[PDB]
Design a binder for this molecule. Structure first.
Ligand code: PLM
Ligand code: PLM
Lengths: 161, 161
């Protein structure tokens, strides 16, 4: 159900180092335990010359932090990509300045609170209230029910432990 | 570190039925799993003639919802009570109208983000954006890192399952 998208996105310009500052989901179970489905920690974004998106992240799987590699396929809309996987999962870029934050959402393309998850990406292991403001504003319309935030020390650890 | 307290509290007037609408803690681990330390669901408040506070709640203990009974001892300040337990745990009433919401916090009396947890109590199994607004406002100053919200259907279930 996400209604915000970044106009004139330059997907080449969001490459490099990112930290998952905060996370929010429509249902508590998507982010609840350490091995929840959308409880992922993004490490780096590597956009393909063909404007695709190679995504590096950590995800707590079977009692330990495992580095993952996912591909987001480009789409006729430049802020929306499709993850190459089952049950179709769309990735929407809401807003970014490329150099400080990146607001994106994740939705099992079925409905709003159906299966929704969003994050606040920031380039540094600092908490950025500016980015978090915008993060919560953007989500204000969304049926979010769980919301995480991490501290600098946590951001420098695998799986934010 | 909580800096808001309800002036002129009438602790006799907050008795009866309450629902835990939302929860927030200074550290993710206090509310994370189903059996986290401050992941409690308040059922009813029963204030003692001697202005003490008998508290009824559910808490997921050893893989199942267990009803608990805790006593909050009155204090020289009327919005602050001490739970009869170890490691001194203070309970602060931030704000209420007795008939719709009640904002309270819980702090292992050591420091702000040390061990903090707050809730948004409401009299009905309805989501009250008014109460949730005020809830988030009050917490705006607080180092909260986890935040839960529940839906009507969940509020009518034991342990909000
Ligand atoms: C511009 C895009 C930046 C944000 C990148 C989107 C993050 C990935 C979203 C889908 C992750 C896949 C679900 C968990 C991963 C896994 O289990 O392998
Ligand atoms: C006016 C006060 C209303 C709010 C009531 C405070 C709720 C209780 C706070 C402390 C709960 C004790 C911790 C978990 C309970 C247990 O393990 O038995």
């Amino acid at each position: 159900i996400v209604t915000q998208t970044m106009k004139g996105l330059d997907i080449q310009k969001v490459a490099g180092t990112w930290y998952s500052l905060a996370m929010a989901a429509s249902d508590i179970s998507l982010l609840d335990a350490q091995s929840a489905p959308l409880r992922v920690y993004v490490e780096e974004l590597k956009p393909t010359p063909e404007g695709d998106l190679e995504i590096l992240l950590q995800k707590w799987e079977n009692g330990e932090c495992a580095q993952k590699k996912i591909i987001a396929e480009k789409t006729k809309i430049p802020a929306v990509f499709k993850i190459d996987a089952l049950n179709e999962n769309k990735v929407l870029v809401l807003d970014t300045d490329y150099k400080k934050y990146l607001l994106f959402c994740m939705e099992n393309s079925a409905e709003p609170e159906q299966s929704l998850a969003c994050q606040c990406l920031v380039r540094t292991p600092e908490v950025d209230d500016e980015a978090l403001e915008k993060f919560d504003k953007a989500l204000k319309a969304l049926p979010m029910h769980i919301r995480l935030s991490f501290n600098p020390t946590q951001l420098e650890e695998q799986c934010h432990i």
